[PDB]
């Protein structure tokens, strides 16, 4: 069957999880790109074995998890090694993603993709929702949540797509500058709208 | 000489050929990406020599043509090999497409590109026309024509950009849910506009 | 701190450097993607070492800098090396760009990017300014500048993003079909707006 896909994105500290949890509480199957990626390389995972074999024993930590910074260093300024890693991980991630879409029982799925803009993954969504906040909010929340410096987060902000680049691809925008309950009004309206879109989309003659 | 390029795209089953042929009917040269892709791997072409060298002489049929099914089967579990193939074919298809745009003597060309959204090729078009239909139509017409199962087309649709992603990059939309004849008037309207756009685009000082 | 990024782009013959110069005259740091590309292959830089590792020590000139002519020929001998080279430079160019934007002293920077649309690099700008001219201007200016044929320029134009593609991603558009001083008034109005956006973007709750 065809499933309706609403993709959710937002920059660091925008409160992506908060909004996705609000939809999850309404019975929507959330498909989380970062959760999937972490599971693909979890201890005893086949791909983690392949990583260790190709790159070295230095790739696996004491506790058995992937040493992400060491792997990063390994592919730095090396397109062939970066290509090798992607050729291993991308199809496993794609497969698990499609699998979860297919196994979803909710009327639409919420696909949470931090890199939606950067990887052009909006092309694979029926609807795009952006959780939006000020860069100030992104800095403060990140500084506080992960106990890190302002300059540290500022560097992360400089590496992700801009706030404007996300808004350029958005169908819907939810402001998340305040407390978690402040999103409830938008979430209720968007959910009711998405359920309607999902119920009509396969046979809908005229778009929008 | 600089030709005005209108790009036509649509999902599987959207009836791209029906619309392109209606533009041909009004005297427009149609350049078809799928046809160009076939032409660049014809017996004797460089791409074919290169493919046999990289993949083996078993990629070449008795009659010297490409064993497409075998090539697809070979690159299927290997993104690296799929990427190699695309990097080879990419500049050759671009070369041939330009050659055929240059040979065209109609007032503008219609460039039919199934993968327009997926490959970001709308960047190369002066104007984008999307042929739009319901997912049900894609399914029913592709089942009815190719005589395949519901669950065969569904897989195609999961591999393609969504309906909404295509509408997101369209300048013009033509609905093709119905019969081929309901298309005639819409195409005539668009052709008149494209004649005007084409007559003025080289010297037009201000954007429309 | 975090600096506001205005991207500038335009096709060949649009007079990008004339616009960039007008903003520099108003006190804005200009960050040029073609200059960055040279800086990332300077002695001591990772891209330089990776080029030498990949192609051989012959890629390094007597003075330790990149032997551009030798690299040019290796790409020509194997066209698919272009892809390796682009893949290497993409991340490194962005990192160097981020580093220079972080170091600028003007409230916003003007980031001049010829391939902004072709490479989707607008995803890394806060705002997009397109310098726009008719194809006729592009043709005549390139003919005069390089003493090349019309037919030679038309092939370049066929190779770059279209006029309409750039207009599709533009936040602001500036006409530069005429004399270099004719842009003065439009640049001043844009400059005043950009300083306001720069002063407000970090704490701005609501988008635009």
Swiss-Prot record, chains A, B, C:
Residues 5-201 form the DPCK domain. GO terms for molecular function: ATP binding; dephospho-CoA kinase activity. It is an enzyme of class 2 (transferase). PROSITE patterns: DPCK. ATP binds at residues 13-18, 145, 176-178. It comes from the Bacteria. Keywords: ATP-binding, Coenzyme A biosynthesis, Cytoplasm, Kinase, Nucleotide-binding, Transferase. Optimum pH is 8.5. GO terms for cellular component: cytoplasm. One of its GO terms (biological process) is coenzyme A biosynthetic process. It is found in: Cytoplasm. Transmembrane segments: none annotated. Its EC number is 2.7.1.24. It catalyses: 3'-dephospho-CoA + ATP = ADP + CoA + H(+). Pathway: Cofactor biosynthesis; coenzyme A biosynthesis; CoA from (R)-pantothenate: step 5/5. The keyword Protein transport does not apply. Catalyzes the phosphorylation of the 3'-hydroxyl group of dephosphocoenzyme A to form coenzyme A. Monomer. Forms homotrimers in the presence of sulfate. The trimeric form exists in solution in equilibrium with the monomeric form. Belongs to the CoaE family. This is Dephospho-CoA kinase. It comes from Escherichia coli (strain K12). The gene is coaE.
